[PDB]
Amino acid sequence: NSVQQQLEALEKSSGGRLGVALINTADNSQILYRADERFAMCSTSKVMAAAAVLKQSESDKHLLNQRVEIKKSDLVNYNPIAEKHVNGTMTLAELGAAALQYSDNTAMNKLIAHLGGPDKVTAFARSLGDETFRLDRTEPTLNTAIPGDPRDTTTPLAMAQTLKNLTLGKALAETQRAQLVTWLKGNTTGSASIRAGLPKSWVVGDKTGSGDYGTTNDIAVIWPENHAPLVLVTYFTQPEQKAENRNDILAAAAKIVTHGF
Numbered sequence: 001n002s003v004q005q006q007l008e009a010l011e012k013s014s015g016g017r018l019g020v021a022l023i024n025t026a027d028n029s030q031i032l033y034r035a036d037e038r039f040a041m042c043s044t045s046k047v048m049a050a051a052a053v054l055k056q057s058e059s060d061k062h063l064l065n066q067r068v069e070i071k072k073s074d075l076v077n078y079n080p081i082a083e084k085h086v087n088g089t090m091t092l093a094e095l096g097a098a099a100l101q102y103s104d105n106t107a108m109n110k111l112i113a114h115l116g117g118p119d120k121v122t123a124f125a126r127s128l129g130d131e132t133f134r135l136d137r138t139e140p141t142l143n144t145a146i147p148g149d150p151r152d153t154t155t156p157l158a159m160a161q162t163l164k165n166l167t168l169g170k171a172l173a174e175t176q177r178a179q180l181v182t183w184l185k186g187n188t189t190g191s192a193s194i195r196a197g198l199p200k201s202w203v204v205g206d207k208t209g210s211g212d213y214g215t216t217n218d219i220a221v222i223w224p225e226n227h228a229p230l231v232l233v234t235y236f237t238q239p240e241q242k243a244e245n246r247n248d249i250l251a252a253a254a255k256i257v258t259h260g261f
């Protein structure tokens, strides 16, 4: 059975909607499944906010070390790193790190506030040639993931192209590109997702995301041992608001599309 048949069967049994885009950077060939369809990004949008600050840092050498005050009122829901710093400060670099590696919601909101609101993240993405991405809200409401709601969504192909440009391509100057890559590789939340569908020795940098409607996402850059990198985005969402998140489906999808490398 083709790779297309297998994803279709995986999607059907799962009872949800699956979106996959794999780019093989060796020859720019692509494996696509519902890749032009919009999905709620949830926490995968944090990469774009962190990337926007890195871009700023290319022309402002003091920026990443700028300190930001964390107060009890800044805290939203789920703040594993920021709660450790109430009444203190975190630099913009520390916020970038926490947001990506721990998916800290307070850190995300701080970064968006620094940039001037969700619309500035959207403008940064456009500046990269990404015409799909839109961020509309802050944490935690950007995670509602209501079916058919276009707010805070992108498509798997658009997000694959953009993640490729950010980590392996021309989006960021080298020092900032390397920082983004260091952050993604140190991610702590993605063991059960894309990483679980791959050979154990491959190196992966990824950002997970989860939200309502059992929306379960992961976007990853993958460095095989003896091949050029792959970029892989897997988005998955379900029709009932209180559906369980399904990291195992992303892992199942990663295993299907990388069988052959």
Ligand SMILES: *[B]([O])([O])C1=[C]C2=C([C]=[C][C]=[C]2)S1
Binding pocket: 042, 043, 044, 077, 078, 103, 105, 140, 143, 208, 209, 210, 211
């Ligand atoms: B992200 O990984 O999609 C996250 C979203 C939420 C978290 C905690 C609480 C509410 C939403 S992490």
